[PDB]
Amino acid sequence: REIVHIQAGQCGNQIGAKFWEVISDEHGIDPTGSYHGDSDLQLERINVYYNEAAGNKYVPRAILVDLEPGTMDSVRSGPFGQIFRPDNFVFGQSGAGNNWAKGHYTEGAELVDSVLDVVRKESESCDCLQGFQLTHSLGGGTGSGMGTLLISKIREEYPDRIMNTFSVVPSPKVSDTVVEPYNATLSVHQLVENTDETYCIDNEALYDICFRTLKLTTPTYGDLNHLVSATMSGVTTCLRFPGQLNADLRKLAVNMVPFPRLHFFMPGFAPLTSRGSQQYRALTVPELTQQMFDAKNMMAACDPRHGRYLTVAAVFRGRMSMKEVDEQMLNVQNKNSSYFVEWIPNNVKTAVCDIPPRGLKMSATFIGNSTAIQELFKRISEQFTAMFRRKAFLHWYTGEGMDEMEFTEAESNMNDLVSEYQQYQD
Amino acid sequence: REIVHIQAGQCGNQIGAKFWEVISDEHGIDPTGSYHGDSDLQLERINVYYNEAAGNKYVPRAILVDLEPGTMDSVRSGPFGQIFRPDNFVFGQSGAGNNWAKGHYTEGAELVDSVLDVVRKESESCDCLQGFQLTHSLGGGTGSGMGTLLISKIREEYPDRIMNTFSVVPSPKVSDTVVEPYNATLSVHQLVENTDETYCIDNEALYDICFRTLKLTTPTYGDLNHLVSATMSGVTTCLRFPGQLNADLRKLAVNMVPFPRLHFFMPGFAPLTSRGSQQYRALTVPELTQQMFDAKNMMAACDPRHGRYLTVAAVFRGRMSMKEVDEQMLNVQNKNSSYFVEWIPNNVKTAVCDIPPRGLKMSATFIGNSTAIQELFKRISEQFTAMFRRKAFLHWYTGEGMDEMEFTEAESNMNDLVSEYQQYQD
Amino acid sequence: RECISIHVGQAGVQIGNACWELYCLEHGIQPDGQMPSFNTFFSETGAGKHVPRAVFVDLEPTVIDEVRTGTYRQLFHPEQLITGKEDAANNYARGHYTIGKEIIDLVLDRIRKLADQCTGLQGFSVFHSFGGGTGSGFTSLLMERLSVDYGKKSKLEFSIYPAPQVSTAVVEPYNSILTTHTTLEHSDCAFMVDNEAIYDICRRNLDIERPTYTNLNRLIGQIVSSITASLRFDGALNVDLTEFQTNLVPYPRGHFPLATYAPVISAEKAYHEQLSVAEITNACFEPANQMVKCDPRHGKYMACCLLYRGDVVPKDVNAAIATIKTKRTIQFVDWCPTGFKVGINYEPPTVVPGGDLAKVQRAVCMLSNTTAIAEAWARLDHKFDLMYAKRAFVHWYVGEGMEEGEFSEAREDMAALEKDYEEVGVDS
Amino acid sequence: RECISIHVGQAGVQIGNACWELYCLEHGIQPDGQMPSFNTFFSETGAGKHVPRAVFVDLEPTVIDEVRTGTYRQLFHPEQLITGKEDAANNYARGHYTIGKEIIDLVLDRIRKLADQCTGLQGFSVFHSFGGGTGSGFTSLLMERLSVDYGKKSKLEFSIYPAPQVSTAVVEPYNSILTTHTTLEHSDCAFMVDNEAIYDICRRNLDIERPTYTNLNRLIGQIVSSITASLRFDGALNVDLTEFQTNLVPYPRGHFPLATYAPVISAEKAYHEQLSVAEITNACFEPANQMVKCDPRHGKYMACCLLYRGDVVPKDVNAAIATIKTKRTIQFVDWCPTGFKVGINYEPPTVVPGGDLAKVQRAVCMLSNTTAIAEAWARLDHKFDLMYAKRAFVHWYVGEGMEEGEFSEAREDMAALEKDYEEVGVDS
Numbered sequence A, B: 001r002e003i004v005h006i007q008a009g010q011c012g013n014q015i016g017a018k019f020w021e022v023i024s025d026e027h028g029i030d031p032t033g034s035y036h037g038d039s040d041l042q043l044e045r046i047n048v049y050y051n052e053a054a055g056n057k058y059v060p061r062a063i064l065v066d067l068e069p070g071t072m073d074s075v076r077s078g079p080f081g082q083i084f085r086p087d088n089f090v091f092g093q094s095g096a097g098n099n100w101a102k103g104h105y106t107e108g109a110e111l112v113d114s115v116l117d118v119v120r121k122e123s124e125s126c127d128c129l130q131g132f133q134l135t136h137s138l139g140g141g142t143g144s145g146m147g148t149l150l151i152s153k154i155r156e157e158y159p160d161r162i163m164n165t166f167s168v169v170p171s172p173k174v175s176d177t178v179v180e181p182y183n184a185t186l187s188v189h190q191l192v193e194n195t196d197e198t199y200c201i202d203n204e205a206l207y208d209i210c211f212r213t214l215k216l217t218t219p220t221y222g223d224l225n226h227l228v229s230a231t232m233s234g235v236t237t238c239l240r241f242p243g244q245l246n247a248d249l250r251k252l253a254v255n256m257v258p259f260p261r262l263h264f265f266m267p268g269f270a271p272l273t274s275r276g277s278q279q280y281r282a283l284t285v286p287e288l289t290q291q292m293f294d295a296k297n298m299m300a301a302c303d304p305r306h307g308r309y310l311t312v313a314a315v316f317r318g319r320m321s322m323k324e325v326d327e328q329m330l331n332v333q334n335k336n337s338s339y340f341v342e343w344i345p346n347n348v349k350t351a352v353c354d355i356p357p358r359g360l361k362m363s364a365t366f367i368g369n370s371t372a373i374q375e376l377f378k379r380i381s382e383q384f385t386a387m388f389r390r391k392a393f394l395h396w397y398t399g400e401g402m403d404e405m406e407f408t409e410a411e412s413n414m415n416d417l418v419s420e421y422q423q424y425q426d
Numbered sequence C, D: 001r002e003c004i005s006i007h008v009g010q011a012g013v014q015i016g017n018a019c020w021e022l023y024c025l026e027h028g029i030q031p032d033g034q035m036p037s038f039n040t041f042f043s044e045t046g047a048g049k050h051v052p053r054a055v056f057v058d059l060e061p062t063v064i065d066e067v068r069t070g071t072y073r074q075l076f077h078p079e080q081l082i083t084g085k086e087d088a089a090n091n092y093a094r095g096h097y098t099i100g101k102e103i104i105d106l107v108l109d110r111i112r113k114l115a116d117q118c119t120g121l122q123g124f125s126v127f128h129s130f131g132g133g134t135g136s137g138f139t140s141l142l143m144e145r146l147s148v149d150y151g152k153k154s155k156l157e158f159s160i161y162p163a164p165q166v167s168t169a170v171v172e173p174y175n176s177i178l179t180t181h182t183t184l185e186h187s188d189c190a191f192m193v194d195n196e197a198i199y200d201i202c203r204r205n206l207d208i209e210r211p212t213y214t215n216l217n218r219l220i221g222q223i224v225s226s227i228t229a230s231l232r233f234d235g236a237l238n239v240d241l242t243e244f245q246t247n248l249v250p251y252p253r254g255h256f257p258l259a260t261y262a263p264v265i266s267a268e269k270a271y272h273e274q275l276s277v278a279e280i281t282n283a284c285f286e287p288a289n290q291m292v293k294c295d296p297r298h299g300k301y302m303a304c305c306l307l308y309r310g311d312v313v314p315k316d317v318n319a320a321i322a323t324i325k326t327k328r329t330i331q332f333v334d335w336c337p338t339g340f341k342v343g344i345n346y347e348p349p350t351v352v353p354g355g356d357l358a359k360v361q362r363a364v365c366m367l368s369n370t371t372a373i374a375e376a377w378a379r380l381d382h383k384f385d386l387m388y389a390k391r392a393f394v395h396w397y398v399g400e401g402m403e404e405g406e407f408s409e410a411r412e413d414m415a416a417l418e419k420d421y422e423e424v425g426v427d428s
């Protein structure tokens, strides 16, 4: 029944800053820590993410990890940085510098032991864990590097808990680190087989949505990470709150994974349009389904109609009829039958929660597992190869002891995921 | 039913300064000597530590001993130095200088006769003694040197009373006297077989706790000795006050000593965390047990999970259910079964008092007897040997007549305790 | 999270003067150290005075005396101000060996003292010039020791690139060739700028036809602050110095990223013109703002790092990157994908009161490693060769114990370096 | 709880002048003895005047007259001020024997008078110099008597260590060799400092290139006060003088702990710099603050005692110790575990008004016994040897009744002492 969340890397720490904000919004918990809500449900299932400390203080069940105090400090300095206890800030001193080898292989490795100890302390604080969630970037040093290391140890300690992670996937246009594909390649090599599932977030796609449908001209990462948190929070609240359908994360995982190795997801979100049009929108189930199916409302820079859909999850929040939902999902399946895989009859699955997100009447979360995902892997693998041949920045990595044959195997493994998507693309 | 306490050495005198302060806090006794409390219990069992002198004055049943008036004076100068009667200040003139030989063997020996006379006067003042307690340092001249001498004579006079002592054990990093291990070695040689039990306090560990969990950056010895007094006062109050379990010091001693020679203890204490987190803490029995088991909350620089646990005492203060306590202790035994010794079924014993420490809702004192203790002896013995071969400062000691063969036997005896811990470590 | 600045030689110190002045401007630090308010660079006293963690070395009293008599004399600790009596004479042979080697032990002990004051030494950086006696001579001597003691700390060097047309030091080629030999092998990364190129920037973007070094170093200071003050301050993407090294150095040789900085605009030029992030970065890929006289279009890129100040939205940056990747003529080496480091600080760009640059609301610094650098070495190759073939001025080194073979060797090491650039240019 | 200071010779007395001045500064004692407020050193009169329990001996009227005409002439009791008419002439033969032996009985009776004034004599300490006639000659004479009468009391000696380079006394080796012979065997512990080393401290840490003895003795006074005033004052760890002996003397030979003191900082150097306990103790293990010119890195440590003033938290001390034990290059002799005495007084460090040292909030004194001391003896060995081989100046001793065999013997005793250091150096 409970979940532990660990954030890492500057990305992960800033995403989590919005995530937790939202969760407390959902439950009426003040930036200082106490509960000042107003709904029974708000406290009722609070346990999944909060420990109530003496005084009616709620402690977010999460660990903030970094290798630079300053980022942690900036998190702590805002509202909701006060709700986190000092003991959840685990950090070192001297960066990682966006270096996998430092993060995973060497220096960051050193910190992980202290992180894990706190993890253990929290695992004991829970009655019964459902699972763990981690937030991070695929091409980052602590985000992926150190984060991955941690994951391999947590999974080891808890094989029976859900291990998932959401991660920022290097967008085709904006890479920061020259070896960002290298770090990503290494994380695939480690993560894929050490996780139950991973979500693919593309900032470029997010920037398109924010202007494309939301028509906004000023977003920052906090605004885009709001959208990210909308999908993350969407998933777990249902599990928390009363609904109609089947509201268990593990069951979601079961329904979305047809094969042990292909567990990559494309998140999307509805409704998600500018205020101008809000006066011209109608709120129906087909309306949400139109926004959910549309590739432009995906947060991943993929194109599901290019690939084939293996699995689709449609999560609904708010009062909807069962009939309408059933029929519209069927219609989707029918009309987009050319994209769905024939091996899975009725490949579109649903989940229904009766609690709407604060401020909306209804909402829906799109989760997909298509073959289209392989295109991201292909882009990375290719870029990787070029760098691999030149050893760009690999003296930094090999200087910290990372061996090229390990990287070679990592490359293969990327190619293996692509070939397996092809194996089920048919 | 009553206890006499004797403090010696600069350490012992300053620890006692906090100890007695706390005891008077517990009973509402003013720094000047009169009772101004407000609870029936506060006076009810006051007899164990105070004599009520005419005028509703309470005299702490303790003797302050030193060989330098100035330390005694500084004690006397503060609050609660006025509650002690002049007759409890027994001191000479000219130090000891942290020299066992002076303390025990020669000069300090001279003072002991006057100390003992006062002891006798107090033993008569009591109705029925339960025992005696002494506070001192293991590597100090008057603390251990003179103090030990006194102990051997008190035990002689009262074989049937409890003889225990709490002592500062030389921390691995901060020794003051070059021959501090020598003094300690000699005190083992004398103390172990002339005491019912001794507690092992490491200042280094204490400094870690104060920053580690208490997050404090200014402690002094008075703040650390506060923690010491918390454990000392924890033990005797239960004996004093109404509870549920079995509240007798001798019974504690019986339950904690499986073998005539292995009576060394590792004190620990809960709850013991910074104020920040106090808004995020929950107060339950498992909460206290988590803090009690955790080696970092031990006041001894040992590691109980390295060794094996022979005996564990869990003392609780405040209202708790019997069930909860029983179950959590069982759980501890179960989950940490790999550290407990198989010869003792249900090796974790409890004691329960219904009076909480002033200001807290609940608290717990951890007392353990592990094999891990032997590691401290090993460190000392080794250091000793090196010094022994060189006779460092032994001209001071041999100059005062201490013979090297006595020291040789002392070395053996240290090694004997280690071998006996090995004999029951299995 | 701490670092040490090292200022060797006039160039190193006078640039440092601008640098520490700027850091004072960044926080409102008074000349006496009183700061009412960046402890990564500074060490605090009980008076609230902060000491810049830096070492000033000059083997001639004069420049340090200039510091000692200026306003910042109260700021600097007397032990930070280290001076000898005699000079290197433009000559590695004395700078590294005969003269500078005598004082270096003191210097190192002051460094070590500061290293002990550091709690989390991230690393350090050394300011000097490729041609001078202490500027390059002594400098490499220092690296020889620092790389032992601080082997795992950042070893970033900043040096003035010898102007191809004007140089006051006739044996500068010889000095620089010797430094190559010894710095390549010890340092982690060396950055450089060309005062001639800078003059062109001053006259074209600032519209100033009278630049002095005190102007030139303000501009350098801007660049340095972007990577020193603002990298310790808050941002979206807080990039560390070790991260810089980890994101800028691709090979174990050295590498030599060159600086480019845009905005460099006079107050009047700022009027009537609106810069965006993208527009500023467009300027960053123009030869015109290249701080070293070396043509960006000649070579191929290997590394590139863009660091942002003030009003920068990643959204815009992303778009800008897309266009520089695809619109420009920037050729790049195969080895590299375009993973360009983006540092994004919220910390606004700062301007020196009484300076030449306009107040800007956003700013971008660019570091880049291009294959065109081999041409810079080619320049040195021939200049060295000419002198060495005639053996002009050789007695000024030989008399201090230098070997002719050594000089040949050093040239050859440079040739090898050029060959490695050749290698990188070959795409693969 | 009382003690006696003994000042023999100019060096002893002039140092004493600084010492008693400092004790007056410690409590606000007026020159006339009026104190408005440390009776371990002082004896009280009904007027509230306190008399420093000390004896001043000079065989030449002049220095004592200097006392007698200064401000502290009212402080000292006329009987404490003992003077002869003629000097020892740099010569043990007269100092210990021919001349000083005549007055010593008086001197002893004044000492005994004070011993009778003491109620709990803890002990005493003697201030002198290893090279002079009364400084070392008379001094050992005194020890010969004091060790009988006060055999169980502290016999701590403090002496100026003969500078290897400058000495005004040509027969100083001879004097010092004779003292070795007679002091080793009688005294409990002798401490020493090198005025040359001190000059280096004055010029490097105080930045003073003009030290006089009146400066030099202020610094000595600091060290002495740490162990004399502050050890009687309150602290956490109140350490006595007997405790000092019991914690510093490892063998029945002598031993000779050397002084080191950090902080020694000029006012300007104190600005902009924050010392911690740990930082001060770091300075204490630096050769640079070593008060004797003898290299700490050469020998091995046997003893070490650290005494703390003012704002010292044991917590910090513990951490500091951990690092000096493990971080440093301090080699130590097997025999010894690192039980270094920590004295921790709350009593703050004090500064002489108009002095050179900066007001500090905390301070650390270090005593240490290192094997490098044998080199100091080696210095004496050859200096003695040279003179003795030629028999230069020998008639100045022979004419007073000295024996040549005796001188050889004394050298041999020194050689034996060196051999024992050799022994200790051999680890075992």
Ligand SMILES: Nc1nc2c(ncn2[C@@H]2O[C@H](COP(=O)(O)OP(=O)(O)OP(=O)(O)O)[C@@H](O)[C@H]2O)c(=O)[nH]1
Pocket: C008, C009, C010, C011, C012, C014, C015, C087, C088, C089, C090, C091, C095, C129, C131, C132, C133, C134, C135, C136, C160, C162, C163, C167, C168, C169, C195, C213, C214, C216, C217
């Ligand atoms: N940007 C900049 N370049 C400078 C400055 N001062 C000198 N330079 C350049 O650095 C080189 C001069 O080095 P010098 O001043 O001769 O020598 P040094 O390196 O200080 O050391 P010595 O030769 O021993 O005096 C020339 O190429 C100058 O153009 C300055 O303040 N700013």
Ligand SMILES: Nc1nc2c(ncn2[C@@H]2O[C@H](COP(=O)(O)OP(=O)(O)OP(=O)(O)O)[C@@H](O)[C@H]2O)c(=O)[nH]1
Pocket: D008, D009, D010, D011, D012, D014, D015, D087, D088, D089, D090, D091, D095, D129, D131, D132, D133, D134, D135, D136, D160, D162, D163, D167, D168, D169, D195, D213, D214, D216, D217
């Ligand atoms: N630190 C310090 N050293 C001093 C002082 N006065 C003298 N000395 C040193 O002590 C030695 C001088 O001893 P003298 O003054 O010649 O003689 P004395 O020991 O007073 O006795 P006589 O030879 O009989 O006059 C030299 O090594 C001086 O450097 C002083 O005030 N302070």
Ligand SMILES: Nc1nc2c(ncn2[C@@H]2O[C@H](COP(=O)(O)OP(=O)(O)O)[C@@H](O)[C@H]2O)c(=O)[nH]1
Pocket: A008, A009, A010, A011, A012, A014, A015, A096, A097, A098, A099, A137, A139, A140, A141, A142, A143, A144, A168, A169, A170, A171, A174, A175, A176, A203, A221, A222, A224, A225, C236, C237
């Ligand atoms: N959505 C999103 N992406 C971020 C944020 N911060 C950094 N990123 C992305 O993360 C990558 C850089 O890795 P970074 O987080 O700096 O690595 P690390 O900090 O060394 O672990 C780039 O692709 C950025 O676009 C953020 O707050 N939100």
Ligand SMILES: Nc1nc2c(ncn2[C@@H]2O[C@H](COP(=O)(O)OP(=O)(O)O)[C@@H](O)[C@H]2O)c(=O)[nH]1
Pocket: B008, B009, B010, B011, B012, B014, B015, B096, B097, B098, B099, B137, B139, B140, B141, B142, B143, B144, B168, B169, B170, B171, B174, B175, B176, B203, B221, B222, B224, B225, D236, D237
């Ligand atoms: N916890 C604690 N330890 C102390 C105190 N005072 C001295 N110590 C310790 O005692 C040892 C020194 O012995 P000391 O008490 O001076 O001996 P004595 O005074 O000659 O009997 C060192 O290990 C100190 O850390 C104190 O007030 N509290």
Ligand SMILES: [Mg+2]
Pocket: C009, C010, C060
């Ligand atoms: Mg110059």
Ligand SMILES: [Mg+2]
Pocket: D009, D010, D060
């Ligand atoms: Mg004289």
